[PDB]
Design an enzyme around this catalytic site. Structure first.
Site, PDB file in Angstrom:
ATOM      1  N   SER A  31     -57.311  62.040  38.462  1.00  0.00           N
ATOM      2  CA  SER A  31     -57.196  63.097  37.451  1.00  0.00           C
ATOM      3  C   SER A  31     -58.534  63.707  36.990  1.00  0.00           C
ATOM      4  O   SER A  31     -59.253  64.353  37.766  1.00  0.00           O
ATOM      5  CB  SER A  31     -56.551  62.519  36.212  1.00  0.00           C
ATOM      6  OG  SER A  31     -55.784  63.512  35.597  1.00  0.00           O
ATOM      7  N   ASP A  56     -57.663  71.016  35.092  1.00  0.00           N
ATOM      8  CA  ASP A  56     -58.043  69.657  35.443  1.00  0.00           C
ATOM      9  C   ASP A  56     -58.285  69.411  36.982  1.00  0.00           C
ATOM     10  O   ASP A  56     -58.300  70.312  37.770  1.00  0.00           O
ATOM     11  CB  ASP A  56     -56.895  68.863  35.025  1.00  0.00           C
ATOM     12  CG  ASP A  56     -57.156  67.457  34.826  1.00  0.00           C
ATOM     13  OD1 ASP A  56     -58.287  67.092  34.514  1.00  0.00           O
ATOM     14  OD2 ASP A  56     -56.271  66.739  34.963  1.00  0.00           O
ATOM     15  N   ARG A 106     -53.474  69.522  33.708  1.00  0.00           N
ATOM     16  CA  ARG A 106     -54.026  69.843  32.375  1.00  0.00           C
ATOM     17  C   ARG A 106     -54.576  71.295  32.347  1.00  0.00           C
ATOM     18  O   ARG A 106     -55.154  71.782  33.341  1.00  0.00           O
ATOM     19  CB  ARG A 106     -55.226  68.990  32.034  1.00  0.00           C
ATOM     20  CG  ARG A 106     -55.058  67.514  31.857  1.00  0.00           C
ATOM     21  CD  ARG A 106     -56.463  67.047  31.489  1.00  0.00           C
ATOM     22  NE  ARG A 106     -56.555  65.651  31.222  1.00  0.00           N
ATOM     23  CZ  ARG A 106     -57.594  65.178  30.531  1.00  0.00           C
ATOM     24  NH1 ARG A 106     -58.537  66.016  30.078  1.00  0.00           N
ATOM     25  NH2 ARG A 106     -57.710  63.863  30.308  1.00  0.00           N
TER      26      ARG A 106
END
Ligand code: VG1
Ligand SMILES: [Co+2]
Lengths: 561, 561
Positions: free
Chosen positions: A116, A287, A292
């Site tokens: 991530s 992200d 995100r």
């Protein structure tokens, strides 16, 4: 292709965190077969009399080592009896795309190669997310079970000579020693199904008109060298018509160029300075795995991700998806501000406060009681799928701007004057003091048990702040009965204001005092100006309490967001 | 989207033949009614109840008016209740590809926007071909219904507002006025279904060591600027590994680069020059449809289309498709050389001789009695689809090279050494006087049918040719039962040599005379000679018995193949 049962030796540290298993790439390369075992424990949760007709979607954010780990998932899942693998082209396949594919082709789970927001250079971090049948993150029960198999593993089945061209789109068959039904690998386009999903969620013509029509909303989008680049290019540029100059940093690099994919005021400097030019009406960064999003306004304006869900809720019916399904429920993580709450409080819709992590939002979604959710960690989403979604949130902001017709700054000034302002900052004390915050964060629990403090008059700075509540956090899932762990204190009162004093639970080497602060203002004047300064009263009471500087030891800032 | 009906006037010339409706570009363009009129009748052949649960495949070749004609198709098919349209990416879909996609997904039929072999520009040619449920070109029974409707069309249903984005992959959904189920437009990858199909027919792994390993076969494939370019780059260059510099002219240009994409040494002169220098081991030229091919060997060695099908047949159990499903039958057209006969007769399998026209191969392929078919007009196909495939032929050639580990020259040289050589050539007489050529065939026919001609001995040097059989070719199709008369005048000689005359001008405009000469030689010293020298006596005999010079005023042919 041959099948060989390779005996191996277990590992201790192979345990998943709030979302997936993440470790330094060296722990993957230098450790004699670390990924082969974690992969084998995953496929082992899927019973033998269920694997031949099963499909595992394997995706990836393009990060370093992604290519080698995909090769392992194909050769290990092949020898273990899994019938089909649906990998995206080149392995590129977003986390909201993997959530989307799983739900579409009814896949029994999915594996994502991504750490991530964690950096990704050849010296940085690499991780393995495991999404279950419902589409989203495996909740603790399934992850710790993978952990429970990682400790007692003795061997793993593998096809060492199964090399697949992940670049070519198409179906391919592989026949392995004595197994009537052939192992299939179906390489799908990365963006396709995901764009077809967003197509029935927003009005793609109304957006097409806003980005390339009567005036052109000049948008600046930073994909931050991560998986969402191809998506901004094929979806916002090639489809909706945004000029090529809008799609910056959209080519997935293993190293991510060097910068960290977590989009925020510090880790994302480039785009905010160029947004200060004033020629852009809206701006957005994403992200690493694209789930995100960070929303920016004209002249470098900033929308707190805790406020972003509040606006996409008071104006939720600007999105067709919600006019057809309805708003069954709102939710936010305990650390995210109370702005969503003020909107939920003014309508007949239920509101839910969950522990930080997308894994427990899904339970509220599956049981039909949650439609819009998100957290302060730049992660807004909905029940359209079960994962968080950065491009769904950007396109949700373009749907609101196009229907309302106002600038981003005015929408929130009007939203703050219509409900009030909820201030917020993630001003941490990352890895700091080895002996101070032990008793300090165990000092308030007990001390308040005296019947004379419910009523405190003030004489500091200005404006009286009346008393009402004050306590701590734990979580009991209303659908299956799961529970949570003590960790973060929070001092509250009459209107709604709080400091989430975070003691680490998994902090072995040291304690991070990750600070989440909240200040709720009612009046017209004190709302529109200043950020970490109008927060003072909350960081006045919160700084005076334990004599902290001479009782613990820390007055030097660290990483503000 | 609003559905409206426009009252239209019909056109008496809209008649679909074997290859759909072939008219000039400037007749569809500004002639308000022409394209909309013909499409309407196509989707009118499918019952109003058989439409909602049905799909139609749509594609073109990437040249003038193709994109404009696909927006027309979707707007009329939608108002007419067609459930789903499967369109390739950008509208680019080759002919073999559409047959593959119709049979894979089982569509009701398909619309192919290709001009067969004529160039595609503002003043050039533009066609509409309609394939039916089995993936083949519609027959007499269905082309007449289309023409009977197109000449009586009073009213036509269209969606004027329906705007489809053809370049973006994925399912686009359109809801129409007054209708409960929505219209679906599904954009598909141009190569994909077609590549996955070849992946099962050939051995792509044996073909990877062949084209890009140490012992590498240097090729050179010219796509002739047509729709087969995208397919050559993705299958040959991307997936099999051939260097990108081998696939030349692989970009479907709007005009096609002026010249016709047709496998003829002169039309493919660039290919012939670059293969004469010595370096390349295999070369190939193509057409703007994907149905024909011109195979060439080291130094410019030409492989005759008629010999090609007899080389693939004698080495047919090299292509896995044939090893796994068997060879149900062989077949050639009547003018094609008897080289396929020497193979089918020795390797004892049913040979079928049919009239010029793919429609006859298809019948035998639908009754499962035909596996491999060959035609002198640069074509070779099989039951893998229900149309002609120019790249399958190239792929069957590379397969035979990898298996035999010899050069093109030696596989034909030792084939001639084991089955003999059928020297072949085809003389064409282009603009001939329509009646003077017709009276030429009739006097020749009366010259053939009397008792004395079935034993005549002809001579022009050492070898004497004794007439064994003489007939005007009649075909009784074992599937439709239908008899096809006329077809061609065959003078079969006792040694296996044949002279064939065909007049293709019996329906409109000036006539063309095609003289096919085929000659069998079995001694090894004479098979090394030049075909035009070897066929010289049989040519003097052809122009003698025909009295061609005399009736047409032609002392030399237009084109010699
Ligand atoms: O407490 P943590 O471990 O820092 O968790 C943070 O990052 C997690 C995974 O993020 V991604 O990096 O999966 O978007 C998020 O799901 C949490 O909302 C965020 O607070
Ligand atoms: Co993420």
């Amino acid at each position: 292709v041959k099948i060989v049962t390779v005996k191996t030796k277990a590992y201790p540290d192979q345990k998943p965190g709030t979302s997936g298993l993440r470790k330094r790439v060296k722990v993957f390369q230098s450790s004699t077969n670390y990924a082969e075992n974690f992969i084998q424990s995953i496929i082992s949760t899927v019973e033998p009399a269920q694997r031949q007709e099963a499909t595992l979607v394997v995706g990836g954010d393009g990060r370093f080592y992604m290519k080698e780990a995909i090769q392992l998932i194909v050769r290990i899942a092949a020898a273990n009896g899994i019938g089909r693998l649906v990998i995206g082209q080149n392995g590129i396949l977003s986390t909201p795309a993997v959530s989307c594919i799983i739900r579409k082709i009814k896949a029994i789970g999915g594996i994502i190669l991504t750490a991530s927001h964690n950096p990704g250079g050849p010296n940085g971090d690499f991780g393995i997310k495991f999404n279950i049948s419902n589409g989203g993150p495996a909740p603790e029960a399934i992850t710790d079970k993978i952990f429970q198999i990682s400790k007692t593993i003795e061997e793993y089945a593998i096809c060492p000579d199964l090399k697949v061209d992940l670049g070519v789109l198409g179906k391919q068959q592989f026949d392995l020693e004595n197994k009537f039904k052939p192992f299939t690998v179906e390489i799908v386009d990365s963006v396709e199904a995901y764009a077809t999903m967003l197509r029935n969620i927003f009005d793609f013509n109304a957006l097409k008109e806003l980005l390339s029509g009567p005036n052109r909303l000049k948008i600046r989008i930073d994909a931050m060298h991560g998986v969402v680049g191809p998506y901004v290019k094929k979806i916002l540029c090639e489809e909706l018509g945004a000029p090529a100059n809008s799609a910056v940093n959209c080519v997935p690099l293993e190293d991510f160029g060097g910068h960290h994919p977590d989009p925020n005021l510090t880790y994302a400097a480039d785009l905010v300075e160029t947004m200060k030019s004033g020629e852009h009406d809206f701006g957005a960064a994403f992200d690493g795995d694209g789930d995100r999003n960070m929303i920016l306004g004209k002249h470098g304006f900033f929308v707190n991700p805790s406020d972003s869900v509040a606006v996409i809720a008071a104006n939720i019916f600007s999105i067709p998806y919600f006019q057809q399904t309805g708003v069954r429920g709102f939710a936010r993580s305990m650390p995210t501000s109370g702005a969503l709450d003020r909107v939920a409080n003014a309508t007949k819709i239920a509101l839910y406060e969950t522990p930080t992590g997308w894994k427990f939002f899904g339970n509220l979604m599956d049981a039909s009681k949650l439609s819009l959710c998100g957290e302060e960690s730049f992660g807004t989403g909905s029940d359209h799928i079960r994962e968080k979604d950065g491009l769904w949130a950007v396109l949700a902001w373009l749907s609101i701007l196009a229907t309302r017709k106002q600038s981003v700054e005015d929408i929130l000034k009007d939203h703050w004057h219509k409900f009030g302002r909820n201030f917020f900052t993630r001003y941490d004390y990352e890895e700091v003091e080895a002996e101070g915050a032990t008793k300090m964060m165990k000092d308030l629990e007990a001390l308040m048990f005296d019947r004379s403090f419910v009523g405190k008059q003030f004489s500091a700075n200005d404006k009286v702040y009346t008393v009402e509540k004050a306590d701590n956090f734990e979580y009991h899932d209303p659908v299956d009965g799961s529970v949570s762990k003590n960790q973060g204190l929070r001092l509250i009162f009459a209107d709604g204001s709080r400091i989430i004093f975070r003691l680490s639970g998994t902090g072995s080497a040291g304690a991070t005092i990750r600070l989440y602060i909240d200040s709720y203002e009612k009046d017209n004047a004190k709302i529109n100006q200043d950020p970490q300064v109008m927060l003072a009263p909350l960081i006045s009471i919160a700084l005076k309490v334990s004599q902290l500087q001479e009782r613990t030891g820390r007055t030097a800032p660290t990483v503000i967001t």
